[PDB]
Write an enzyme that holds these catalytic residues in place. Structure first.
Site, PDB file in Angstrom:
ATOM      1  N   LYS A  76      -8.189 -44.147  79.472  1.00 55.43           N
ATOM      2  CA  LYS A  76      -8.726 -43.931  78.124  1.00 55.43           C
ATOM      3  C   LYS A  76     -10.169 -44.370  78.108  1.00 55.43           C
ATOM      4  O   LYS A  76     -10.515 -45.394  78.681  1.00 55.43           O
ATOM      5  CB  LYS A  76      -7.970 -44.733  77.034  1.00 55.43           C
ATOM      6  N   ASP A 127      -2.456 -44.147  82.325  1.00 56.38           N
ATOM      7  CA  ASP A 127      -3.300 -43.222  81.564  1.00 56.38           C
ATOM      8  C   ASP A 127      -4.686 -43.853  81.423  1.00 56.38           C
ATOM      9  O   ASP A 127      -4.814 -45.052  81.117  1.00 56.38           O
ATOM     10  CB  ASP A 127      -2.708 -42.989  80.174  1.00 56.38           C
ATOM     11  N   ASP A 161      -1.450 -39.400  83.186  1.00 57.31           N
ATOM     12  CA  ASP A 161      -2.425 -38.974  84.186  1.00 57.31           C
ATOM     13  C   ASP A 161      -1.888 -39.194  85.577  1.00 57.31           C
ATOM     14  O   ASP A 161      -1.990 -38.316  86.442  1.00 57.31           O
ATOM     15  CB  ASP A 161      -3.745 -39.729  84.023  1.00 57.31           C
TER      16      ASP A 161
END
Lengths: 231, 229
Positions: A90, A88, A72
């Site tokens: 989540k 990232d 990301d």
DNA sequence: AAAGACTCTT
DNA sequence: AAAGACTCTT
């Protein structure tokens, strides 16, 4: 450090904020739905500016993916390109929780597959995990009245290898599964792998189906024995 | 009717960010998951306004991963439910993924809110869009950059816009026709009927291996029927 | 193309 | 558990 600062900012913003819905340029506000698909999006958008501020403070450049590419956010100093940080976001909902930590057949197996930069240029892979408890158009003067589809959002920042588990998180989409535990365990880093190398080796040799795995290994105990004996 | 009204409302109804309770606005990202999420939230109010105006109640799935996004029906007529699913794609000839072919179309109770047989219509609301790390305040609304240059929408029956090629592989989805927005609006499909649409997808094999010995497109399917299936 | 990249349920 | 449900690109 960047990490500590990042953690504090996310922790802070999350204490003093609740996302209410989407807003149009004409000021009409639309409420959120219950699908985690909605919330993942909301938490990713909510995190963007925070990551960027903290990064900029520490001299890091930030780059987002182009579709279907991890991570990301890619962070790095212009002077040290070969030392990138991949972050990232989540999300999951609620008690033990579990996350899907990304595919095990892409970049961890092929240096340049589905990743923004070659995998070997990253020195760290962090996971910002959001945990939330599942619970008409509006005008600006009504922001306090709009009902939200969640409660008790918790956030944590941890290294991927540290919270990675030994069981797949998805079948057909071949994802690494995280440990199945309590939020505290994620914050504290109470995982199962001893090193990031052990993590990478285990997931690089994990077979896609149980039939294939029966002959090799299905969990960390079996993996270590398989290693002891010569693979 | 409910359909003409819905279609008119949709055309009638520009999102630029998420808003917090405290009035801080966060811009939209370029991510694919972003816009589909945005278009689904934007549609909910419209759908509910029109439905209620026609005596229909709207229900959304409670369990995730169950079709459809919206189930409309009158409590008096429970076997005349309508399914509405929001689909999104972009432009810079488009194509949509129209749902799975291994779930409810093959198993009446699989991943669906109500048994497949209770639905008399399956509508697709398709959104097409042509593709800032700072927050803003309500007063800066007009300056927030959007990650899309234009948006078109349409409502159409699922079978009418369905194609003969899969939309995805591992996630076994039905592919829609690969045409221009115009064709979707008018309904320029390939299947003769919904019954043919259903038969083609209920017997479609997952991989090209299994398929090459049966059928891979509409012509081959028609020949497969001639051959006695 | 056709196949495989990118959280949840049972 | 493991397997299979829920738009894009190579």
């Amino acid at each position: 450090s960047l990490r500590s600062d990042l953690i504090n900012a996310l922790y802070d913003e999350n204490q003093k904020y609740d996302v209410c819905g989407i807003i149009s340029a004409e000021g009409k506000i639309y409420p959120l739905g219950s699908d985690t698909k909605v919330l993942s999006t909301i938490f990713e958008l909510f995190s963007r500016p925070i990551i960027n501020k903290i990064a900029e403070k520490h001299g890091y450049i930030v780059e987002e993916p182009q579709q279907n590419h991890y991570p990301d956010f890619t962070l790095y100093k212009p002077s040290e390109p070969n030392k990138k940080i991949a972050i990232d976001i989540k999300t999951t909902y609620t008690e033990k929780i579990k996350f899907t930590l990304g595919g095990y057949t892409s970049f961890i197996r092929n240096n340049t597959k589905n990743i923004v930069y070659p995998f070997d240029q990253y020195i760290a892979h962090w996971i910002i995990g959001y945990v939330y408890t599942r619970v008409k158009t509006y005008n600006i003067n009504e922001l306090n009245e709009i009902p939200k589809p969640y409660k008790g959002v918790k956030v944590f920042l941890q290294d991927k290898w540290v919270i990675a588990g030994d069981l797949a998180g998805s079948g057909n989409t071949t994802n690494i599964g995280s440990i199945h535990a309590h939020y505290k365990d994620f914050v504290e880093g109470k995982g199962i792998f001893d090193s990031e190398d052990e993590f990478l080796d285990y997931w690089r040799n994990y077979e896609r189906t149980s039939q294939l795995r029966n002959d090799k290994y299905n969990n960390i105990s079996e993996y270590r024995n398989w290693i002891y004996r010569g693979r």
